[PDB]
Write an enzyme that holds these catalytic residues in place. Structure first.
Site, PDB file in Angstrom:
ATOM      1  N   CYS A   1       5.101  -2.399  -4.963  1.00  0.00           N
ATOM      2  CA  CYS A   1       4.709  -1.175  -4.866  1.00  0.00           C
ATOM      3  C   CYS A   1       5.661  -0.117  -4.354  1.00  0.00           C
ATOM      4  CB  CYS A   1       3.280  -0.859  -4.453  1.00  0.00           C
ATOM      5  SG  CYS A   1       2.826  -1.845  -3.129  1.00  0.00           S
TER       6      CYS A   1
ATOM      7  N   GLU B   1       1.026   6.363  -8.240  1.00  0.00           N
ATOM      8  CA  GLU B   1       0.333   5.232  -7.655  1.00  0.00           C
ATOM      9  C   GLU B   1       0.472   4.105  -8.654  1.00  0.00           C
ATOM     10  OE1 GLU B   1      -3.071   3.336  -7.728  1.00  0.00           O
ATOM     11  OE2 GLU B   1      -1.506   2.485  -6.420  1.00  0.00           O
TER      12      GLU B   1
ATOM     13  N   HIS C   1       0.821  -1.139   0.000  1.00  0.00           N
ATOM     14  CA  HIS C   1       0.000   0.000   0.000  1.00  0.00           C
ATOM     15  C   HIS C   1       0.902   1.251   0.000  1.00  0.00           C
ATOM     16  CE1 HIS C   1      -2.653  -3.030   1.989  1.00  0.00           C
ATOM     17  NE2 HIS C   1      -3.298  -2.768   0.881  1.00  0.00           N
TER      18      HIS C   1
ATOM     19  N   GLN D   1       2.078  -1.927 -12.327  1.00  0.00           N
ATOM     20  CA  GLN D   1       2.373  -3.057 -11.478  1.00  0.00           C
ATOM     21  C   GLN D   1       1.331  -4.143 -11.665  1.00  0.00           C
ATOM     22  OE1 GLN D   1       3.213  -2.045  -7.394  1.00  0.00           O
ATOM     23  NE2 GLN D   1       2.469  -4.015  -6.636  1.00  0.00           N
TER      24      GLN D   1
END
Ligand code: NA
Length: 192
Positions: free
Chosen positions: A110, A67, A50, A103
């Site tokens: 991440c 992101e 995250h 990704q």
């Protein structure tokens, strides 16, 4: 699984982002940005996955939010739009957000992708998202197709590019290469 805050901090330092790096944050952005200084940060959006990257260019007056899943999570997008607006209120302007995924959905890389973006920002803060030597190594895919079989090879190639980049640029990564690769692997979350 994934990457710890201390791992990411060591890699960001290796990548030369130290002079601009504000730290790692739990859920919230940094307190402020200055009209006088480049800044960047990594945010854990849950509180070793995250991870999202933040950057700020005071000359173009642009905040960037990188992101790896392209803000395909609508709640995440909503939260951090508001975080951006709140940051501006505390600091006394444009937001550029990721729009495509780089990704694989089963990957735990991440945090590493966020480090790679911060390298791109520290070196090309006028164009950090795309059209620079670091990010040109990585290909985005449409969010609606994130889980489609056909894009997985592209997302895997991105991860291979990421590891190879980190081997060239980070002594910390080399010292921990097999460990980090295992913990962040492309199909860490799929075993079929
Ligand atoms: Na790219």
């Amino acid at each position: 699984m994934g990457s710890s805050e201390q791992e990411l901090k060591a890699i960001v330092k290796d990548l030369g982002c130290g002079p601009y790096f504000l730290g790692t944050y739990d859920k919230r952005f940094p307190g402020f940005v200055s009209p006088h200084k480049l800044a960047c940060a990594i945010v854990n959006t849950a509180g070793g996955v995250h991870w999202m990257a933040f950057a700020w260019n005071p000359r173009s007056k642009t905040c960037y939010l990188f992101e790896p899943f392209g803000f395909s999570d609508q709640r995440l997008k909503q939260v951090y739009q508001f975080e951006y607006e709140s940051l501006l209120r505390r600091s006394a302007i444009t937001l550029e957000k990721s729009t495509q995924s780089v990704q694989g959905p089963n990957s735990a890389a991440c945090g590493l992708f966020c480090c790679m973006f911060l390298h791109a920002f520290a070196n090309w803060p006028q164009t950090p998202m795309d059209h620079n030597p670091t990010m040109n190594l990585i290909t985005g895919v449409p969010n609606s197709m994130l889980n489609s079989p056909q894009v997985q090879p592209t997302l895997r190639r991105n991860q291979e590019q990421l590891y190879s980049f980190l081997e060239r640029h980070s002594p910390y990564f080399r010292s921990h290469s097999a460990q980090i690769r295992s913990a962040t692997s492309f199909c860490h979350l799929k075993n079929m």
